[PDB]
Amino acid sequence: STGSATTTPIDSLDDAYITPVQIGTPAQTLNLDFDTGSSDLWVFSSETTASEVDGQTIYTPSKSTTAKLLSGATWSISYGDGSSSSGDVYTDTVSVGGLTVTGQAVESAKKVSSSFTEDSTIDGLLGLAFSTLNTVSPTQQKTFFDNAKASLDSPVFTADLGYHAPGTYNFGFIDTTAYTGSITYTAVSTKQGFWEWTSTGYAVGSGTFKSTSIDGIADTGTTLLYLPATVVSAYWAQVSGAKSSSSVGGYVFPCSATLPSFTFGVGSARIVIPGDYIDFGPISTGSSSCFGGIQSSAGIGINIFGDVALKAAFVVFNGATTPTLGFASK
Template identity: 25%
Template sequence: MKFLSCIAAFAFVDLSVAQKVVKHNFDILRGSSFEKAQKYQTPQFVKRDDDEYEFFINNMETYYQMNISVGTPGQDMAVLLDTGSSDLWLYDSAAKYCSKLATSTSSVATASTDLLYGATPSDFINPKFDNCGGIGGFDSDKSSTFHRNKTEFLIKYGDNTTAEGYWGRDLVTIGDTKISNLTFAVAAFTNSTPVFGIGLPGAETTFGEYFIASENYTYENLPAKMATEGLINTPAYSLFLNDVDEDVGSVLFGGVDHSKYSGNLTTVKVVDWDGGLQVTVSEIDIQKGDKVAAFAQGKYLALLDSGTTLTYLPNELYETFQEFTNATWDDNIEQYYYDCDEIADTTISFDFTGAKIEVPLKSFTFKQFGKCVSGIQRYDYDDVTYFILGDNFLRNAYVVYDLENLEISLAQAKYNGGKEDVEEITKKGVPSAVKAKYYSDTYIIGEHDVTDATSLLYHSATPVVSATTTSSNSKATGTASSSSASSSSKGSASSNSLSSSLLVSVFGLLSMLSFA
């Protein structure tokens, strides 16, 4: 999903031992647009004419840019790596509309690569832009190996950016790695950044609501195609975003690097809902010094999304989180902020049915005007209650996405881990990973109730927020195959989405007063 925010230029790295593993390092860049992003940038406020300040996510976005070559002879392209969507699409070199984000339609609440289904071509926004901003447009007429399949391509993301064009197949080269006949789209009308989605087949737009049910299909996207071509054993990859001050991260297709994490690599189930890479969050704790209290307990859906810069909480939790972490509202910038010194010893602990990741509260902030502004935002689409855990969460975790077995393995990220220790991932799963203690106790679509939600008490802290969730007629089909087995497409504004109500415990609130 492209909750847009940082660029990364991928460089092919040859592994010293011949393995079925393909590694790419990428530069992490930030900027006001894909083509203007640079290293070492941070989110910024923009001054209005009335001397007040506004904050827009799209004014300082983070991109993980993958440099690829497409066609024969090769044409150089730059695309945004995204675990939250599943399609590769490029600019058409003949596009009338191209390049920059539609900032007039984006906002803090909607800067996202979360896919929106149910839109029609008439909903698409086609502002006039420059000539692809130097990112590169694909000229299919100049490639001798391109095959057009005459199927229309339509996609709309959660930040109202869109793309429209046609589908085809061609040779795609990433570093020295060649993938023949890879399916991708060419967009003639767009106000978005080209995206290289590497998620589940069920999130592909060919399986979305733009197609009638009888015509829906999935295809082999990059991870699946790499497995079919024998470049990797199974459609799986590891993502390491590195520390916030670093400018290089890595993605490892088909492998895991044990030097990039500490503790156990713990495996959890992917929640099979609408084709997305969601997992179950069972508890969130807030720790200040030696004091711990449970902020949220139950079963919540959480999307792990490298295409999203910040972290988003559902409405019901957003205000409570800011209150419990002693955030202060600033009317000028219309954001919550902290005294930077006061949050130095505060940590947020996320429990994914037994896999735990700790994130310093400072990682969820960025400095501006001497303040630590909150990087936790509100996710306020109707009827959508899941978390979106973006880059400011993911940089604290080492994450392995096993698309074959519908599993995700997590561990605490280790920066400066020394010499690489790379091992192949096989169809049996991720090497050295252990199953989470409550591996099977996941969010179940249509069967979730308050008893289940409040029964997962992993430690003795007094619960502050419990979850009561209901569901109606949600789709739950999926695929654990690298081929084109069916799975339901992911929609952040679907009529099938979950609804939730949150109960605040008075006793839990009182227990938090000792934090102040």
């Protein structure tokens, strides 16, 4: 089997992407944030504290003929941005882009933090990191990908995120029409439960490529590119008037600037992030200070190849017995 679903930016900045997901019988369609940096499929629900719901579509298990309480199971998760959610668990039928899994753990939120409530466009998360990170207790649950894997034509999914445009998540196949050139595959460590890999270096604009190992994770659920402070300083030094602002929480730059591209290495291959991808617009409405899309990972404890990086590539998440990542230009 295969599946193919379109993923759509939630706003004009590509702050996140939502993908429609069918849950239950009859189907309840919720728009979920597919997150290769976490391993829980959780949803706003009929159980969510009413004051914490503001515009989201909810899953109502009582209206699904295939829903069953997973008795005793609870979940609770905290993300890198400080957001959180928790609740109980049902199993139900979940379909993505025509690919169906029966018996998927659907984590029903009883509580969500303010950032979730305030985002009316995201109805929950669908985790695509390794199932070792899943938070369900006392019986850890599998991700949608891990449950689908054995049925797929190939044990893979691909992320093809758009810049200010829709893109695609495919399950079970490579769309050879969706990228240019060849795919370069690179090793993955699953030791921390992430799609963790090592980039071979970087370049700023038209500058020379710096060969250096950068360990980080491929994380579709993170908006920005978080890299070591040395790398990030080297990038923003090429933008007149850019500076790190402790008050704003990262590098800012004049909205009048034209940003240089950023290149990262994948083995001997190179992915180029156009400068425009690194502009996250005014820090507050009407400001002439703009927020940068490349930020320091110092204090986060890991480098993160978030959407800024991933949307410059066609990315293969190879879940074969030895997982690997692939990157192609597009």
